[PDB]
Amino acid sequence: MIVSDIEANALLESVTKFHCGVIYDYSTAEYVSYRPSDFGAYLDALEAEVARGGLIVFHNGHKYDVPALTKLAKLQLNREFHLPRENCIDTLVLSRLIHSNLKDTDMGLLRSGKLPGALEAWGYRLGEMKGEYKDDFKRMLEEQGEEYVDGMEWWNFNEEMMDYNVQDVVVTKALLEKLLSDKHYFPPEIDFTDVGYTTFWSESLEAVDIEHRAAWLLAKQERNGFPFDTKAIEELYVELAARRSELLRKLTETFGSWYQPKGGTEMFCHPRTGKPLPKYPRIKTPKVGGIFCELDTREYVAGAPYTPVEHVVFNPSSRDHIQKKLQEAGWVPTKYTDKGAPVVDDEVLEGVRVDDPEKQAAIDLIKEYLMIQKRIGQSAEGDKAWLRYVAEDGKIHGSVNPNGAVTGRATHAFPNLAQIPGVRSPYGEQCRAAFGAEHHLDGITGKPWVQAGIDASGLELRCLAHFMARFDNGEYAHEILNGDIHTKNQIAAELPTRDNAKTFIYGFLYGAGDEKIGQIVGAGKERGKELKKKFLENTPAIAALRESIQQTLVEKWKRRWIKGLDGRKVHVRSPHAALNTLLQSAGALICKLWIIKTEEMLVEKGLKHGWDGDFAYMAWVHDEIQVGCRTEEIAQVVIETAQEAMRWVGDHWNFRCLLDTEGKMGPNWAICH
Amino acid sequence: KIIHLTDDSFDTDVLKADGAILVDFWAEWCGPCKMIAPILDEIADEYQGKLTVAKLNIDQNPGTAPKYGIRGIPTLLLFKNGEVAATKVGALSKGQLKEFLDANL
DNA sequence: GGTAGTGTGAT
DNA sequence: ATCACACTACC
Ligand SMILES: [Mg+2]
Incomplete structure (x- = not known):
């Protein structure tokens, strides 16, 4: 296992030069620096670790160092270089999973000051490195009476940069060992800095394997753009x-x-x-x-x-x-x-x-x-x-923090492609229509691509049905796929129409108060405690689910977290939003493994991921994906494959409610709603 | 004695007065304004048949002040034959006013 | 240029 | 409920 970091002249989008790199090898316990003319050697050392079936550790390498090296190797050395996904570990990805209750500056893109709560120390140091290197550069310049320009600190390699590169590896290594010391994710009987990649993935908590696969896939989605x-x-x-x-x-x-x-x-x-x-x-x-x-x-x-x-x-x-x-x-x-x-x-x-x-x-x-x-x-x-x-x-290359929310959901930014106005809102259709596979012309034929939009069907209600099956023996789940749960909730709530129920339930699951509840409830706002009471009365399994969730968290706390579908701890902020935390988290993890499996299945079918291939992930918005496809035939295969993967996920985690997806083919996001 | 102006009456009441018109742009919430108000009442009498004291409340008549570039209040604008002769910003005293007028008249 | 306070956009 | 980000108003 080796820990590494590189310094290059720019962000991924425009990087053209490798400045330096450092490698700390656990088998030798040594640090080795590589300067500009050592680039080829740097790449050789990473590939040698891959040949041994080892592991390469980077901090934010999935989104930067790894794709950057591929790009740089091609440009500077005419070499094909592609580190396999399974040989790479990312401490940032690891930090976001293990410290999912804490925010981070997303590597300096967000100012620490406006972030709420505390920040993990080593990760904070890593995220501030570019700014600190800049400050040093600027004051070292002023000492010589020279002027400072835009971001000249990154134009040329220098020894101050080399020293920061070494510091990144000492800090990344420190971070690595602190995260590796969490027995909930890494069994204490195993030294994870001394195992092959296959052992690392199979012996650690499933959440670790899943988060690295998600960050690897989403990094590519970012590179694809929309x-x-x-x-x-x-x-x-x-x-x-x-x-x-x-x-x-x-x-x-x-x-x-x-x-x-x-x-x-x-x-x-x-x-x-x-x-x-x-x-x-x-x-x-x-x-x-x-x-x-x-x-x-x-x-x-x-x-x-x-x-x-x-x-x-x-x-x-x-x-x-x-x-x-x-x-x-x-x-x-x-x-x-x-x-x-x-x-x-x-x-x-x-x-x-x-x-x-x-x-x-x-x-x-x-x-x-x-x-x-x-x-x-x-x-x-x-x-x-x-x-x-x-x-x-x-294309717009929106950023995605694969595990940005406490529940395991991802967060989107720069810009947030998860907040595009819906077709059902003013100017929504025009906004939505501007994001689409049709706006991409094939690199060879010049013909527009086609879009495959797929979303999980009533995921939130099925997650509820699943968790209550232990109490109702699958009854609620059975009604979802063979009857009309909306009429069923209607009766239980005594609500007027059936449309009132869809509003009530979907609202009941996303918080809301008696006011909002009683609101659409004909009109009579407030006094919406009766509707929310007669409901839990005629749906005892839900109330039972809530009781069990609490007996697990309180009594002062017995435990401040919920165990997610893949074993991770999911911090609970409020005993009252516990069930919500449990459901949102399960939907998040199901959708995460789902987009992962979908892509793996497409690739095992011979399809190539990329604009120079057959399909391209453009966006992942919680319970839906928008995928660009070279042809309509490919669009249909993606739609069908996404359904297979959803069914595979449900089976994978023994879900007590059948999971499904609905897919639509078209030219843009407005038509694939 | 004092003339209470409005946006719509300002043109003919002030700009076409042809006599001597001292206008005070004021507001109910201005401390200084509340100070010169009593003064102006006395100046109106003493200068009757020599000057005309007119007031324009800027909250009630928001259209006229902007055209004159008011930046502070109370603002005293002394119009002669439709034009601005003198100008003074601030709650002057009974004496300072008598001097301002006697001089500019 | 930076922080509140308020609201809207989506799942 | 989870989270991004815009626009006013004050320092
Ligand atoms: Mg780095």
């Missing part, structure tokens, strides 16, 4: 921009501008008493100035105070502005936030009722305005707007 229709979004942007302007024109006419105190320094004091008046706006007492002798054109006069003010135009994006105008119109806020401000969201705005019919109509313009900005910010103007992220290859 074909994006820039022109179509630039045109939607023009359309939304004109509607925003028109709504602004109409609103600033209805709600005129006003004045506000601004720039005042001195406290206003009563001229008679001398008593400070903090509630009054601040003032400014002109230092100089006088009436006249040549008259003084100066407008200020010493001693004569005044209140500095600014002119402010109505801003529809300001809940403060909206709050001010609607009350001056007669609106009396019914609900406030914990800070003193009244709630001003689409829901409240929908219920505001003022006299002036014009100002009453202006409310809808305001709601429209807010929704338009939401779309403009997400697609074009936001910091993480799609238009700022589209790469040269015509």
Whole structure:
């Protein structure tokens, strides 16, 4: 087993030069440095470890060092270099699994300061390395009276860089051993720094093997990217921009501008008493100035105070502005936030009722305005707007933290491709249609690719059915696939229609309170404790499931975690959200193993993963995958194969409810909904 | 004595007055404004038939102030034949005002 | 340039 | 319930 790390001139997307690399070999207990001209030798040492059936350890190597070396070996040495998945260990992936309750800076892409909670120390050091190397570089430069440029610290190899490369390996090794000392994942009777790759995967907890496979697959998905229709979004942007302007024109006419105190320094004091008046706006007492002798054109006069003010135009994006105008119109806020401000969201705005019919109509313009900005910010103007992220290859390469949530779910960012507006929302179809396999033209034939969209069917309800089978003997599961559980829940809840049930159950599983529950419940909000009571009464298995989950966690805690489908610990934040934690976690792990198996099956069928092949994973959004396929025949095979893999997963973990998938073929995300 | 202006009456009441019009842009929430208010009431009488004291509340008439670049209040604008002759920002005293007017008149 | 406070986007 | 990120307002 060896631990390694490399330093190169740029992020994966544009790396062209290997600067240096370090290898610590457990069999020799030694560190070896490789400088720019030792690149070939560096690669040879990694392949020698592979020939021995060994293991190579990197920190964030799955997403960076490994694909970077393949790219770099081809460019610099004309060599084919591909470390096999099974010979690679990633301490970042390991840290995110074992310390799944803690956040991390995602290797310096996120500022430590805004992250909540504590951070694991070695992983924090690794994530800050680039910034610390930069700081040293900059101050070393200033010492020589030289100027600093953009990111020149990465243009050329130097010894400071070599020293940091060595430090990464000492820290990565330290991290490795700390993670390897967790007996829940690694049995203490085995020295995992002294075994072959096959032993490492089979003797450790299944979660370890699964997380590395997921990070390996998703790293490739990131590299694939999602074909994006820039022109179509630039045109939607023009359309939304004109509607925003028109709504602004109409609103600033209805709600005129006003004045506000601004720039005042001195406290206003009563001229008679001398008593400070903090509630009054601040003032400014002109230092100089006088009436006249040549008259003084100066407008200020010493001693004569005044209140500095600014002119402010109505801003529809300001809940403060909206709050001010609607009350001056007669609106009396019914609900406030914990800070003193009244709630001003689409829901409240929908219920505001003022006299002036014009100002009453202006409310809808305001709601429209807010929704338009939401779309403009997400697609074009936001910091993480799609238009700022589209790469040269015509694709958006969103990042994915394979195990970003405590439940085992992944998190998406830069931009978040898991929050694209749905077809059922305003401008959703156009947004959705811009992400699609059709926007990718085959590298050889130039013909557009086809999209295969597949999602797990009612995964959340089946996970519930599974866990309650120990109490109802498969009854709830049986009803899901052979009857109508929605009518069944309806009766148990005494709810009006069957559609009320789908809203109730899916809501019951995603939190919600008596208010939201009682809401769609005909209308009568609140007093939604009766609906949520008559339900658990006519569905005793669920209540029973909850009792058992608690007897496991409390009494003060007996244990602060839940065991996931693959054995991992899943931190429970609240005894009340425990069942939810259990269900979301199971759905997450099922979907994770599922996308893994699906890809392995496609590959064992002869299909090649990549734009230069047959298919390409474009996105994984919790319970669905969007896959690009060179031909329709391949799209159909992916759809069928995803169903086989889902069934394989259900069998793999002895699930008490049959698991299924539904697939749709088409040109983009809007059609594969 | 004082003329209470509005956005719609400002043009004819001030710009086309042809006489002597001192306008005070003020707001109910301004401390300084509350200070000169009593003063202006006295100036109106004493200068009757020599000057016209007019007031424009900027919360009630948001349209006129911007056209003159108001940055602070109270703002005293002395209009002569539709134009701005003098200008002064701040709660002047009864004396400072008498001087401002007597001079600029 | 950075942190709250509030809300929306999706599963 | 889990989580990304936008826009205002204040320092
Ligand atoms: Mg590294």
